[PDB]
Amino acid sequence: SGFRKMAFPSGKVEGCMVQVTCGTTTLNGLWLDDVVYCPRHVICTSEDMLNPNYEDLLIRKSNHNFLVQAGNVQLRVIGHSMQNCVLKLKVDTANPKTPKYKFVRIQPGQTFSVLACYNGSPSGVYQCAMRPNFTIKGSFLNGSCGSVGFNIDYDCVSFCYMHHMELPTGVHAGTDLEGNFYGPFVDRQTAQAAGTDTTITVNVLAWLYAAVINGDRWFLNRFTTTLNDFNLVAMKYNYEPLTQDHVDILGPLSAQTGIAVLDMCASLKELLQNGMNGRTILGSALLEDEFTPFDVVRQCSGVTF
**106 DSSP 8-state letter:** P
- HSE toward the beta carbon, residue 67, CA cutoff 13 A: 13
185 near ligand SV6, rule: CB under 6 A = yes
Point out the catalytic residue in the list 16, 145, 160, 265. 145
Given the complex with a second copy, which of 109 and 138 has the nearer CB atom?
138
117 binds, among ligand SV6, a second copy, none (CB under 5 to 8 A by kind): a second copy
State how far the Cα of 46 lies from the Cα of 41, in Å rounded to an integer.
10
- Of residues 49, 67, 125, 249, which one binds a second copy by CB under 8 A? 125
The catalytic position among 16, 38, 41, 160 is 41
The answer to whether the Cα torsion of 299, 145, 99, 109 is positive or negative is positive
Residue 141 binds a second copy (CB under 8 A)? yes
Measured between alpha carbons, how far is 41 from 188 in angstroms, rounded to an integer? 9
Kindly tell me which residue out of 57, 156, 167, 282 binds ligand SV6, with binding defined by CB under 6 A. Answer: 167
What torsion do the CA atoms of 147, 174, 53, 78 make, to the nearest 10 degrees? Answer: 30
The nearer residue to ligand SV6, 150 or 185, going by C-beta atoms, is 185
Q: Pick from ligand SV6, a second copy, none: which does 64 bind, CB < 5 to 8 A by kind?
A: none
Residues 236/275, Cβ–Cβ less than 8 Å: no
* Cα torsion through 60, 63, 67, 72, rounded to 10: 180
Please state whether beta strands 156-166 and 101-103 pair in parallel, antiparallel, or not at all (unpaired). parallel
Indicate if 41 belongs to the active site: yes
Chain residues that interact with a second copy, rule: CB under 8 A = 1-12, 14-15, 115-119, 121-126, 128, 137-144, 166, 170-172, 214-215, 280, 283-286, 298-305
Question: Which residues carry out catalysis?
Answer: 41, 145
Chain residues that interact with ligand SV6, rule: CB under 6 A = 25-27, 39, 41, 49, 140, 142-145, 164-168, 173, 185, 187, 189-192
